[PDB]
Design a protein around this ligand. Structure first.
Ligand SMILES: C[C@H](CCC(=O)NCCC[N+](C)(C)C[C@H](O)CS(=O)(=O)O)[C@H]1CC[C@H]2[C@@H]3[C@H](O)C[C@@H]4C[C@H](O)CC[C@]4(C)[C@H]3C[C@H](O)[C@]12C
Ligand SMILES: C[C@H](CCC(=O)NCCC[N+](C)(C)C[C@H](O)CS(=O)(=O)O)[C@H]1CC[C@H]2[C@@H]3[C@H](O)C[C@@H]4C[C@H](O)CC[C@]4(C)[C@H]3C[C@H](O)[C@]12C
Ligand SMILES: [Mg+2]
Ligand SMILES: [Zn+2]
Ligand SMILES: [Zn+2]
Lengths: 558, 1164, 100
């Protein structure tokens, strides 16, 4: 009704002052974005919200557009805008809202979150370390390191100990336990054998990226296993309408032998007789199953639960990292508010800060006892600064050169004050340590070039781009001269013998896409390039004559 | 080469079909070397080389290596104009809704999903999940869920539940959508949804669904997945002086997209939480939005400045856009301007071109001549010759220029006479010399104006200038056929001084033998130029079948009358020069010469008139002195009487006998009346003088005073400015329009003191401030009109329709203010004109009513002729030459082809510039009233009409309005009206009224006049009103032009009975289409659909154009383009503005034959 | 590289260089016309691979390539005055020329 009255009063008036809109727009609205959207829609209506009343002639002259589909759409938006009050358009307001939804963290809470992340990654550690091919490939990595295909510190960052000698002794102890456990699954204590092997390894430590590689190895292993499960069951569940109970009673529990499928065609059921035409692909799937059972160190189901416990640890630690990042988003915003006017928008600063804060959260250790802020503030501010130095100028200056520009500005801002008028570049190079040419090029580095739509202005309302000329064009007089010279060259070569003409057309690039060379020319004339040189020289001497090249003389410009 | 433009939504795959490579890095150039980067917006692999036939690094530097792709940088060696053509693309890491199909008002995504705009925006900016095919689980498709609600609904539902939020949500809503299936369900509901809003929006939606089906578009293409990249040379980063660069704003927006997209890929690869990735997606959304159309979100992101960046939608729209002043208004070569001077010796067909401008413009022609004649060996030698400006470049200039027109154009081209082809006459100096009789067309005085000369380059353009625009072809105003070659001020004063007798000059009452002897007598000084003599005159009268019989007699004329008779051609009578010959006498002299003899004798006559006027005006010696302002002696007597009257009225007012404002009115009236007496006294003192005489007695004759001779010859001035010069100045206004009641009792022969000179400043500054701002928007009415009447062209020779308006005189209460012969001249009759004897076919039919037929018509006193109108032409997509008339710019009939719509727009706009710029009420006037007239706005107080015919009857009493019903003599009366009792009626309830008749009184809304009475009624209404204004100020413009504008106005039809046709009922259709449709459907065994004719104001009618390349010019480019994309429209060009834009001939002028032959091919 | 204010200008043929003194600048006292070289400046550039028949032209006349543009300051067109004055400004790095 209210805003409806406003719309109808405008549409009968043909205009609207800011005052009338203010009187008629609702009173719940506090921000100016909903108010400006209302003004935009109402102008689209359209009624042209103004500041002052229009003249009597400005009503008649002002063109009226454009009914009326947009009329209906605008009215149906305006009738609804008055109801929902919290509506907003800025991504920053939405971000601040959905970040204020979380509750801040406390010191002991940060200790809890750090220890929980450590527990999750430690569970992942144990699940991976209970994979024997993992330690086998790790010993192979260290061996190919010992063959100097890598570094004794590159492959892994030492162990949980501070010299590589004790490390290599740990390697030898690991190899001894490995030989005493791996060829000794003769199961009663080989369980505790591989337990002890993984335990003695757990004091060790590898580079993170190699450990991620091991993670992906186990991932692909379990994935091929479960995809054998997929092609098996989906070709029994949907290709044979298999009740899952038969699956759980045959497949689960053993999961390896051919009793649950290859002894599953004698179940005295119709789908069991269907399973013949699905016995080939599922039979090969059991083949890959048993092959990977050999390729697991144990059965398929045990490695299933191993990678499962790994996944449990990974999900726990990931949710923990998430909770820490959610808590400290406010810290990231507080830091990013310091850089808001150096070329990058506010949300971009916050996003770079969030990436850096994730990186710091991955590196936090509460064994020391410092505040999380005191550590992560470093990574946050570095992330934001590199972001501004990398993606704030249109023409990208490398980071170190931008540090040099900041230093130049600092020293100049100091020296002009202390020295009087201004520092001449010799004076800066003296005060600085630079060689005074580097300083001059640093000065010459352009800055934030300009919008080519800049006014000129007021002469014709022509932006700057109208006066920047194209210097790559062959102006029509130039092309005319070019083709005139082309025709003249043709009509000169007409006055040469066939040999001279061919050798001069081919030795130069006339009417062919080369630029033939002397050997390739004299191939067609059977000369060893010396007589061909002589023939070129004779033709050039002949055309050199006046009364044969007066026109070609005129083509010379000087 | 194309014959049509097509448009559609761009598929992601097709956007990769255009691309030459995916831009990944944000960088532009190297900052040190300035080389393009490997994946930046300015790449060499993606967008091609930087120098011609030369790879980036430089391994391949031969044109023989053409087309091969280098190995060290992958930059294929081509021409670097290829870099102005190649697009790239950006693989968006998240779908991002295209802002045009979302934030446009109807919101094609919203009205296509059948979803509210705010709801989609909530799903899009990550407020609320949306159900996207949630199975059978009681979930509602397109039902929003909130965050907490989505969680708890997922509780108890581990099953899919298929809910998504973000742009991917809208993309999965559109992709899943079945369009024909929804068309089927909406047809089935439109079957049984017979209520207005429901079935209304049903049909309004099924229209867009069927359209999306036909256009080939897929609904989900409005969600961008790939993003195309404008090529580098359309958004350069060029260096300015001193290491300085200048970029486009487009590079900034592009970098913003690339950065945020790369960061989003990073966030996804880093497994960040939901808050961060959601916020990154929102940011990418706003970045892509700002890139496409900066400002629809709010707020327009600003650069390294306070102002917003310019974007793609900005790169097309706005007067700084492509359509406005790069698609029509272009800078042109072979052209140049200078400062015009008189050059009064030229003929009407030539212009003095300076030798230096002529040697610059005609450069290639001169080079060709020097190398053709052998004077220059090659083009370089000719270049050096004409650079030195040797002695033979001048002979070559004379030869080249010889028959080669130049177009002269002055800045406000209000009409087509602001461009004329002239033959160049080489002159010294640097000023263009412009003929005197051409300034009226150009609106050019010689106090510093400048003219632009362009050079026609082709034979076809040389023949278009010579045959069409040559200055001796255009001599009649295209708005009204009166000649536009009227001699202006020295000419008319010459012809007035010479053709103006006095009572006793030298040689009175000699009988000369003829004009030769009168001239020989005057030039030897034996007789004076105005000395009444009997002279023997032989005049030739074509009183015959064009036979030109001679007749000699003995007239009584002055010596100058007969000296001037020597220049007048044969067919003209002798009474044409036997009077004083002021201004109108000369214009009518040229006019009768044109109506008798045609164009060649009239051009010759015009030149001879200018020559003799200037010669005998110089011999006139007509100076201007201070003793020429004869202040009347009875001026201070009259002012004493008026001052006494104001003193008496002030004494009565002081005694309470009058009020204050009453006495103000009285004193303003007293001063206006005394001013009238002083002006009358001074002009009666100035307009006559005493002189002696044959017999010796004093005798009064018209004064030879110079100020009066200039005001009375019509040469310059008038008795009002004369009054300000010697009479008193009068009362002066203020800017408000009030009148300062302290008059200016002084003149300019006397002085004004400081106070009166201050008081005059008020009105002076007001008038100048208005004239300075009228100059700003000088051509807005012309532009508004050429928006709607542009595509109208004379395309046919005869339509055959017998419809026609009845042209008759306009009797404005008393006498006629415009006779029938004037309103009817040039029109083609629609039926046989019977003699007043009512059995004699006076003018049979289809007879171009020229001056012979028009005189025959006024002679018989036949005063109502049925003429064919442009508004009643049965032609489709055009007008015929018979329903149009004659040209009025050329005496003949219109040619098949002539673009009469643009002629009509300019013929109404240019004459409108002589009207007041602000509306004044007396019948209002001024230009704004005319613009409102053509906008067909509804008057607030409509005199209500009688919608149906029958017995009048009333009804209920005062339900707000007194109610009435009209009930037919035999028919039904379902129409009743809520007549306001404020609308004080005109007819009692007991007088049966015919349909279409007045009920109340007041302004008649033209819509109701059109709907009640014929289209002829609305057209006569509009022409009579607008011509009321144009005659109010005294301006003459024909009715043909208003009629063609109106025919552009009422060009929409609304269908009542859809018949056996294929038209929806409550639909508006281009009337020219529905006409052919019902004609065809009635051709076969069907019946046509009957419609109600509509009417639209010009700004509303021009918004409904069949094309979209044209409609994106004068409209909002964004809405028009969004609509055309979702409609899959194709522009088969067929227009003027579209063919201008796309760069081929228009179908209007000489291009008509080209388009006819092309239509022959396309139909073969 | 840098550009020089030299008088050893490309193709222009020892008449346009008549006004210029040794350092390349016009004399204070000369009356130039439109086109005359006030300050002769030669700019560095690359080769740019002159097309054949230009290769053949310069091979027949032996007039080898310049490598240096003639981007000098010549009087605008239509003006014809006396050169009443000449000021020179050399940055502190650039040494100076004879006219300076
Ligand atoms: C005319 C225009 C005003 C627009 C209102 C102003 C605004 C920005 C100005 C340019 C920039 O400063 C860059 C550069 C700096 C150099 O040192 C001197 C040259 C340059 C090209 C300047 C010329 C001119 O002065 C510009 C175009
Ligand atoms: C005449 C015009 C003002 C008109 C109002 C003046 C004022 C500053 C001038 C520009 C600057 O010099 C910068 C730049 C230098 C390049 O080298 C040539 C182009 C530029 C854009 C110049 C063209 C023009 O000359 C400008 C716009
Ligand atoms: Mg002027
Ligand atoms: Zn290369
Ligand atoms: Zn017709």
């Amino acid at each position: 009704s209210q805003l409806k009255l406003l719309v109808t009063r405008g549409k009968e008036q043909g205009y609207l002052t800011y005052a009338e809109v203010n009187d008629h727009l609702p009173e719940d609205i506090v921000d100016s974005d909903q108010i400006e959207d209302i003004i935009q829609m109402i102008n689209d209506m359209g009624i042209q919200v103004m500041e002052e009343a229009p003249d009597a002639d400005d009503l008649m002259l002002a063109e009226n557009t454009a009914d009326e589909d947009a009329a209906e759409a605008a009215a149906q938006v305006l009738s609804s805008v008055e109801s929902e009050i919290g509506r907003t358009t800025d991504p920053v307001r939405m971000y601040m809202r959905e970040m204020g939804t979380v509750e801040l963290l406390t010191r002991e809470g940060e200790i809890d979150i750090a220890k929980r992340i450590e527990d999750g990654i430690n569970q992942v550690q144990c699940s991976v370390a209970e994979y024997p091919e993992a330690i086998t490939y790790l010993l192979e990595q260290y061996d190919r390191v010992e063959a100097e295909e890598a570094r004794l510190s590159d492959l892994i960052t030492g162990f949980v100990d501070i010299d590589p000698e004790l490390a290599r002794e740990k390697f030898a102890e690991l190899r001894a336990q490995y030989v005493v456990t791996r060829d000794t699954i003769k199961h009663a204590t080989a369980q505790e054998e591989i337990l002890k092997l993984s335990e003695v390894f757990k004091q060790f430590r590898l580079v993170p990226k190699q450990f991620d590689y091991l993670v992906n190895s186990m991932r692909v292993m379990m994935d091929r296993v479960r995809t054998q499960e997929r092609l098996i069951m989906k070709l029994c569940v949907e290709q044979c309408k298999m009740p899952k109970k038969n699956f759980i009673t045959l497949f689960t529990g053993n999961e390896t032998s051919d009793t649950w499928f290859n002894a599953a065609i004698a179940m005295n059921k119709p789908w069991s007789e269907k399973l013949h035409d699905v016995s080939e692909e599922v039979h090969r799937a059991l083949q890959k199953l048993q092959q990977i059972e050999e390729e697991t160190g144990l059965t398929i189901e045990q490695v299933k639960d191993i990678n499962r416990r790994m996944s449990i640890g990974e999900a726990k630690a990931r949710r923990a990292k998430k909770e820490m990042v959610e808590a400290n988003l406010r810290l990231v915003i507080s830091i990013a508010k310091k850089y808001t006017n150096r070329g990058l928008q506010f949300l971009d600063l916050i996003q770079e800060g969030n990436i850096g804060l994730m990186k710091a959260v991955d590196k936090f250790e509460y064994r020391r006892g410092y505040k999380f802020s005191t550590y992560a503030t470093w990574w946050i501010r570095q992330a934001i600064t590199r972001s501004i130095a990398d993606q704030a100028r249109t023409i990208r200056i490398p980071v170190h050169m931008i540090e040099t520009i900041n230093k130049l500005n600092r020293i100049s801002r100091q020296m002009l004050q202390e020295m009087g008028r201004e520092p001449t570049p010799e004076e800066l190079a003296e005060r600085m340590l630079m060689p005074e040419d580097k300083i001059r090029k640093v000065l010459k580095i352009a800055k934030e070039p300009i919008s080519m739509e800049t006014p000129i202005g007021d002469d014709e309302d022509s932006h700057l781009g109208d006066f920047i000329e194209d210097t790559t064009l062959e102006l029509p007089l130039d092309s005319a001269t070019t083709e005139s010279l082309r025709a003249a060259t043709h009509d000169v070569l007409a006055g040469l013998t066939a040999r001279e003409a061919k050798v001069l057309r081919m030795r130069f690039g006339i009417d062919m896409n080369t630029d033939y060379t002397l050997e390739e020319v004299g191939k067609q004339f059977d000369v060893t390039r010396e007589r061909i040189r002589q023939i070129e020289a004779k033709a050039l001497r002949k055309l050199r004559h006046p009364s044969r090249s007066e026109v070609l003389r005129s083509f010379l410009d000087d | 080469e194309f014959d049509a433009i097509k448009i559609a939504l761009a598929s992601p795959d097709m956007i990769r079909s255009w691309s030459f490579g995916e831009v990944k890095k944000p960088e532009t150039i190297n900052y040190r070397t300035f080389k393009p980067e490997r994946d930046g917006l300015f790449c060499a692999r993606i967008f091609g080389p930087v120098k011609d036939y030369e790879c980036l690094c430089g391994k391949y530097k031969r044109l023989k290596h053409r087309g091969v792709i280098c190995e060290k940088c992958g930059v294929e060696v081509t021409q670097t104009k290829v870099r102005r053509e190649r697009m790239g693309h950006i693989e968006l890491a998240s779908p991002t809704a295209h802002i045009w199909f979302l934030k446009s008002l109807p919101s094609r995504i919203g009205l296509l999903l059948d979803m509210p705009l705010r709801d989609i925006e909530r799903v899009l900016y990550f407020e609320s999940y949306v159900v996207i095919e949630g199975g059978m689980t009681n979930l509602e498709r397109q039902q929003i869920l909130t965050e907490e609600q989505y969680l708890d609904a997922l509780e108890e539902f581990g099953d899919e539940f298929d809910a998504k939020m973000g742009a991917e949500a809208i993309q999965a809503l559109l992709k899943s959508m079945d369009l024909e299936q929804e068309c089927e369900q909406l047809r089935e509901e439109l079957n049984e949804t017979n209520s207005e809003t429901k079935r209304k929006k049903l049909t309004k939606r099924i229209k867009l669904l069927e359209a999306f089906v036909q256009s080939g578009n897929k609904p989900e293409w409005m969600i961008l997945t790939v993003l195309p990249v404008l090529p580098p040379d359309l958004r350069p980063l060029v260096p300015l002086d001193g290491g300085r660069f200048a970029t486009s704003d487009l590079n900034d927006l592009y970098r913003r997209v690339i950065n945020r997209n790369n960061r989003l890929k990073r966030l996804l690869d880093l497994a960040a939480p939901d808050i961060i990735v959601r916020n990154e997606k929102r940011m990418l959304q706003e970045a892509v939005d700002a890139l496409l159309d900066n400002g629809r979100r709010g707020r327009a992101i600003t650069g390294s400045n306070k102002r917003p960046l310019k974007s793609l939608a900005d790169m097309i729209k706005g007067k700084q856009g492509r359509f406005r002043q790069n698609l029509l208004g272009k800078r042109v070569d072979y052209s140049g301007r200078s400062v015009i001077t008189v050059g009064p010796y030229l003929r009407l067909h030539q212009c003095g071109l300076p030798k230096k401008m002529a040697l610059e413009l005609f450069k290639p022609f001169i080079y060709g001549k020097l190398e053709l004649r052998g004077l220059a060996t090659t083009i370089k030698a000719a270049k050096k010759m004409v650079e030195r400006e040797e002695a033979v470049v001048w002979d070559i200039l004379d030869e080249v220029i010889r028959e080669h027109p130049v177009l002269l154009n002055r800045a406000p081209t209000l009409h087509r006479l602001g461009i004329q082809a002239f033959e160049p006459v080489l002159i010294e100096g640097k000023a263009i010399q412009l003929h005197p009789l051409v300034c009226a067309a150009y609106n050019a005085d010689f106090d510093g104006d400048q003219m632009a000369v362009h050079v026609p380059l082709t034979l076809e353009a040389q023949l278009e200038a010579r045959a069409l625009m040559m200055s001796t072809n255009n001599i009649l105003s295209p708005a009204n056929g009166e000649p536009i070659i009227v001699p202006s001020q020295d000419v008319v004063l010459g012809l007035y001084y010479m053709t103006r007798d006095c009572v006793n000059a030298k040689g009175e009452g000699m009988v000369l033998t003829g004009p030769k002897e009168a001239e020989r007598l005057y030039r030897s000084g034996l007789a004076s130029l105005h000395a009444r003599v009997k002279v023997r005159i032989t005049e030739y009268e074509k009183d015959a079948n064009g036979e030109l019989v001679a007749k000699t007699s003995l007239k009584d004329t002055t010596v100058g009358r007969a000296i001037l008779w020597m220049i007048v051609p044969k067919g003209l009578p002798y009474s044409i020069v036997n009077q004083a010959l002021g201004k109108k006498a000369i214009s009518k002299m040229l006019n009768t010469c044109y109506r008798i003899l045609g164009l060649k004798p009239t051009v010759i006559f015009a030149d001879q008139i200018m020559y003799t006027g200037f010669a005998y005006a110089a011999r006139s010696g007509a100076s201007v002195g201070i003793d020429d302002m004869v202040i009347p002696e009875k001026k201070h007597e009259i002012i004493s009487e008026a001052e006494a009257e104001v003193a008496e009225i002030q004494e009565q007012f002081q005694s309470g006998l009058v009020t204050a404002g009453e006495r103000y009115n009285k004193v303003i009236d007293i001063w206006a009346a005394a001013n009238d007496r002083v002006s009358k006294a001074m002009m009666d003192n100035l307009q006559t003088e005493t002189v002696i005489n044959r017999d010796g007695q004093e005798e009064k004759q018209v004064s030879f005073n110079s100020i009066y001779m200039m005001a009375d010859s019509g040469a310059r001035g008038s008795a009002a400015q004369i009054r300000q010069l010697a009479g008193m100045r009068g009362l002066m206004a203020k800017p408000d329009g009030s009148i300062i009641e302290t008059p200016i009792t002084a003149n300019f022969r006397e002085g004004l003191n400081v106070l009166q000179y201050f008081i005059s400043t008020h009105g002076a500054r007001k008038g100048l401030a208005d004239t300075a701002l009228k100059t700003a928007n000088s051509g807005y009415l012309t532009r508004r009109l050429v928006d709607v009447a542009q595509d109208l062209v004379v395309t046919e020779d005869d339509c055959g329709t017998h419809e026609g308006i009845m042209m008759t005189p306009v009797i404005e209460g008393g006498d006629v203010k415009e006779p029938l012969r004037d309103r009817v001249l040039g029109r083609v009759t629609a039926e046989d004109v019977l003699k007043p004897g009512t059995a004699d076919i006076l003018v049979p039919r289809n007879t171009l009513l020229h001056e012979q037929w028009c005189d025959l018509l006024e002679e018989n006193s036949v005063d109502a002729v049925k003429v064919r109108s442009v508004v009643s032409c049965d032609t489709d997509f055009g007008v015929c030459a018979h329903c149009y008339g004659r040209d009025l710019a050329r005496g003949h009939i219109i040619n098949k082809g002539e673009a009469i719509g643009v002629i009509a727009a300019q013929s109404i706009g240019e004459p409108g510039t002589q009207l007041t710029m602000r509306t004044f009420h007396i019948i209002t006037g001024g230009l704004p009233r005319v613009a409102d007239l053509f906008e067909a706005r509804r008057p607030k107080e409509p005199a209500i009409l009688a919608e149906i015919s029958g017995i009048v009857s009333f009804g209920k009493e005062t339900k707000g309005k007194r109610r009435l019903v009209i009930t037919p003599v035999d028919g039904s009366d379902p129409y009743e009206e809520m007549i306001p009792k404020w609308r004080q009626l005109n007819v009692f309830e007991g007088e049966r009224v015919e349909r279409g008749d007045v009920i109340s009184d007041g302004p008649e809304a033209p819509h109701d006049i059109l709907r009640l009475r014929g289209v002829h009624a609305v057209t006569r209404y509009i022409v009579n009103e607008v011509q009321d204004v144009y005659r109010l100020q005294g301006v003459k413009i024909n009715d043909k032009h208003i009629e063609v504008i109106v025919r552009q106005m009422l060009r929409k039809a609304t269908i009542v009975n859809a018949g056996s046709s294929d038209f929806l009922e409550g639909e508006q259709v281009e009337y020219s289409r529905v006409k052919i449709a019902n004609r065809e459907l009635e051709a076969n065994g069907k019946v046509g659909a009957t419609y109600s004719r509509d009417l639209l104001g010009i700004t509303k009618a021009s918004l409904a154009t069949e094309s979209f390349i044209s409609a994106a010019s004068f409209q909002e480019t964004t809405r028009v383009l969004t609509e055309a994309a979702v409609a899959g429209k194709r522009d088969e060009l067929r227009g003027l503005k579209e063919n201008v834009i796309v760069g081929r001939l228009i179908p209007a002028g000489t291009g008509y034959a080209y388009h006819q032959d092309r239509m022959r091919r396309r139909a073969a | 590289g840098p550009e020089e204010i030299t008088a050893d200008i490309p193709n222009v043929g020892e008449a346009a260089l008549s006004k210029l003194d040794e350092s390349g600048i016009v004399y204070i006292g000369a009356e130039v016309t439109g086109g005359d070289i006030l300050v002769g400046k030669v700019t560095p550039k690359g080769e740019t691979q002159l097309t054949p028949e230009e290769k053949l032209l310069r091979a027949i006349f032996g007039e080898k390539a310049s490598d240096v543009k003639d981007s000098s300051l010549r009087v605008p067109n239509g003006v014809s005055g006396t050169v009443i004055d000449v000021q020179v400004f050399t940055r502190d790095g650039v040494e100076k020329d004879k006219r300076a």
